[PDB]
Design a protein around this nucleic acid. Structure first.
Length: 798
RNA sequence: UGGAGUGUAAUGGUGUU
RNA sequence: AACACCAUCAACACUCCAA
């Protein structure tokens, strides 16, 4: 449970399709770079970079480095130092800096690591290279999180009010098969427009000009302007000095008063306008507008609008209106070719091969994106049943149930209707029409509604939920489903899930109000999928004969994900397959320490599933496929250490000396890796993304370890995010082709739609279970997520 | 709450007049 | 009570499901 497995082979299945990734090939010298520790007493990163810059130029006689922003420093060539601390002093129109030698980061070892010589890739080297590549834009651009942003060169994309659209990019140095690469992905966000506050007022209050009004209109405009400007920074323009607006004056600049404290003699009552007239010899062109209160309320510092400008680099947090969000998505999340050309454009205007800090270390980055071969895997046949037992073939990652019926359809004979929407806006005609339509779609799907509901009543208040269901359960012998019509976002849903999933173990299905009023066959169809799954039936199965050889022996599939609160316990969810299709899953959910991604009680959970598996299959799993979702790279060593043992432990304490092969895989949807079609004809749909099933396990993947990219879904909008799979462990010794095909095939067992999803069904289900347990003093709440006896044996989370 | 896709700080710590 | 720094994968919105 210590070392991750090396990549066994390279996949050869599927048709090859020429691709380009957003990785940029880097040329790195064999020189050793020198690392030094800094000690600065007592400061923000920008201040540190500035201080280091001064220290660089002011100590050139004694001693062109790159800087981390925090105590960490690197140089290309060595300098006059020793292990001894060398402390000095600098001055900013006042700091003490201590430079100490640390280490010699050899890039020869990096070439040896990328090559077959050394198995391990030195992390310190990756850190160093990243610091080098980031030192310039950390000062040149506006850093946000792990990205760098900036304004627009020519045109200015506006949003209205004081906002505008700033574009940016996220860079990170990554290792590859033979050559270090620079991963870069563009992004965009909303900053505050660098304009005079007078114009900020104009734009916020919908003024064509400031001279449209000469007297303030109302307190409400003061509140609106305050709501927009309170917290922002502004710079002054009659001296330079940057200030932070704390409030807005009620009174005009001509009447807003303050204690003048004119040297000795203390205070005299003076108005702001009069102050600017006397002190700064400035008559207010617009004395009638109120003032910005800056600094401390006790300090009484006020400023007229015509001397304040809003400083740039201020990102917005305020809510965005319809036009703002529209213009945002109408200028970002563009099609794949557009994003591609934007990244190319970015690599053109950033110009890394000309920057001095980059040139200092003799690094060369390719101005063209990385060409990668790639291959599109083959979609599995989906077997439907009914009288015809028709087959559905996924085309472009999507299929349909046209002239097809469920592999195992359930004849629904007893069901109920409980509408929580007001009858005023939800008539009985709506309910009856919805019932007819639903019955038709149901009978067509292979899950026939054999007759009218045995119950149909309006209601109100969450408090009506718990009593009623009991009554409903005791009156009608053998009811199968309870349908709950909801009027939109409501805590009622949460109570319906509480009573339904935990208390009685009754199959419940909520439907939003509007979908009862206006009904489309698609909605009713997917809804029927959900119903048929919730009642223990089987929508569709993978073609039995068309499966990887892993299915030749009893194998269980596990999915795991963790969800964290907005102080409250986090929750980890682990699901497991219960047949050999594999269509049916059972869910286990636990509560945990705050924001602890490492699943603590995993072992126990696994045990349950394993036990349940046997109970459902009368077979003991010879193999365990564990899809862990939600963990990033920096956690792997930790997670792989505990959870794998937790899995293994669960296999030992259960029966004898039973140790099946565990295949620990990590799913990742959150990463900065993009893929584009080289051939224009290979583009798919309006978004022009790569075809569903696109697999890449070369060039841009890990040099030694077992990882691969898989885009298993069709891009509906924007640019697809290819799901990343990193095999942290493999006892079954899978081949690349077999495991990739297995994954892509498990991406088709999602029962909520007739489409291929981005991540495998177990992981998705785990996410759904976790997010479901979210709606449901620590040991008290620990029993709140424990679902019902009968609910356990179902897929309620769907 | 029919479904899929993709766009965008909180805490504990040290410290401050 | 504000303000600095170091360690740490939920909401909202849009697109698509006529010819």
């Amino acid at each position: 449970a210590f070392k991750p497995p090396p990549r066994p082979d390279f996949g050869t299945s599927g048709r090859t399709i020429k691709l380009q990734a957003n990785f940029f090939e880097m040329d790195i010298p064999k020189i050793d770079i020198y690392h030094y520790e800094l000690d600065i007493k007592p400061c923000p990163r920008r201040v540190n970079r500035e201080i280091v810059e001064h220290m660089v130029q002011h100590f050139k006689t004694q001693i062109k480095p790159v800087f981390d922003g925090r105590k960490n420093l690197y140089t290309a060539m060595p300098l006059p130092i020793g292990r001894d601390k060398v402390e000095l002093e600098v001055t900013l129109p006042i700091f003490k800096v201590s430079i100490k030698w640390v280490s010699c980061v050899s890039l020869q070892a990096l070439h040896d690591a990328l090559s077959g010589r050394l198995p391990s890739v030195p992390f310190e080297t990756i850190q160093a290279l990243d610091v080098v590549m980031r030192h310039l834009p950390s000062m040149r651009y506006t850093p946000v999180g792990r990205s760098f942003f900036t304004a627009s060169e020519g045109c200015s994309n506006p949003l209205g009010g004081g906002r505008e659209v700033w574009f940016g990019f996220h860079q990170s140095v990554r290792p590859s098969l033979w050559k270090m690469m620079l991963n870069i992905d563009v992004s965009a966000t909303a900053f505050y427009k660098a304009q005079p506050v007078i114009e900020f007022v104009c734009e916020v209050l919908d003024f064509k000009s400031i001279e449209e009004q000469q007297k303030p209109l109302t307190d409400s405009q003061r509140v609106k302007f305050t709501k927009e400007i309170k917290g922002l920074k502004v710079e002054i323009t009659h001296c330079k000095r940057k200030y932070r607006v704390c409030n807005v004056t009620r009174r005009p600049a001509s009447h807003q008063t303050f204690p003048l404290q004119q040297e000795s003699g203390q205070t005299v009552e003076c108005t702001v306008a009069q102050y600017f007239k006397d002190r700064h010899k400035l008559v207010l062109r617009y004395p009638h507008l109120p003032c910005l209160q800056v600094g401390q309320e006790q300090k009484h510092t006020y400023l007229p609008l015509e001397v304040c400008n809003i400083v740039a680099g201020q990102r917005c947090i305020k809510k965005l209106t319809d036009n703002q969000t529209s213009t945002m998505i109408r200028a970002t999340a563009r099609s794949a070719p557009d994003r591609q050309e934007e990244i190319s454009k970015l690599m053109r205007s950033a110009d890394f091969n000309t920057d001095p800090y980059v040139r200092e270390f003799g690094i060369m980055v390719k101005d063209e994106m990385t060409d990668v071969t790639g291959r599109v895997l083959q979609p599995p046949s989906i077997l439907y049943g009914g009288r015809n037992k028709a087959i559905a073939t996924p085309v472009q990652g999507v299929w349909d149930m046209r002239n097809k019926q469920f592999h195992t359809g359930i004849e629904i004979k007893v069901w109920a209707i409980a509408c929580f929407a007001p009858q005023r806006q939800c008539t009985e005609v709506h309910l009856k029409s919805f019932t007819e339509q639903l019955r038709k779609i149901s009978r067509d799907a292979g899950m026939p509604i054999q007759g009218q509901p045995c119950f149909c009543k309006y209601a109100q208040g969450a408090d009506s939920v718990e009593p009623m269901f009991r009554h409903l359960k005791n009156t009608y012998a053998g009811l199968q489903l309870v349908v709950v019509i909801l009027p939109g976002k409501t805590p009622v849903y949460a109570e319906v899930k509480r009573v339904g999933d935990t208390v009685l173990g009754m199959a419940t299905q909520c439907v939003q109000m509007k979908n009862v009023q206006r009904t489309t066959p698609q909605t009713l169809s997917n809804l029927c999928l959900k119903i048929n799954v919730k009642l223990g039936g089987v929508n569709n199965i993978l073609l039995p004969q068309g499966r990887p050889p892993v299915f030749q022996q009893p194998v269980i599939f596990l999915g795991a994900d963790v969800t964290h609160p907005p102080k409250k316990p986090s929750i980890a969810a682990v699901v497991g397959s219960m047949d050999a299709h594999p269509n049916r899953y059972c869910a286990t959910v636990r509560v945990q320490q705050h924001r602890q991604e490492i699943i603590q009680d995993l072992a126990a959970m696994v045990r349950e599933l394993l036990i349940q598996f046997y109970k459902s299959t009368r077979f003991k799993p010879t193999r365990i496929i564990f899809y862990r979702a939600g963990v990033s790279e920096g956690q792997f060593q930790q997670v792989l250490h505990h959870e794998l043992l937790a899995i293994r432990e669960a296999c030992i304490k259960l029966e004898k000396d039973y140790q099946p092969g565990i295949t620990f895989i990590v799913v990742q949807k959150r990463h900065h890796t993009r893929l584009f079609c080289t051939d224009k004809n290979e583009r798919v749909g309006k978004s022009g993304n790569i075809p569903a099933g696109t697999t890449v396990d070369t060039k841009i993947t890990h040099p030694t370890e077992f990882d691969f990219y898989l885009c298993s879904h069709a891009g509906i909008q924007g640019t697809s995010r290819p799901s990343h799979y990193h095999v942290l462990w493999d006892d079954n010794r899978f081949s690349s082709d077999e495991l990739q095909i297995l994954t892509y095939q498990l991406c088709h067992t999602y029962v909520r739609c007739t489409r291929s999803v981005s991540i495998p069904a177990p992981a998705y289900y785990a996410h759904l279970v976790a997010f479901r347990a979210r709606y449901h003093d620590h040991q008290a709440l620990a029993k709140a997520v424990q679902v019902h006896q009968d609910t356990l044996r179902t897929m309620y989370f769907a």
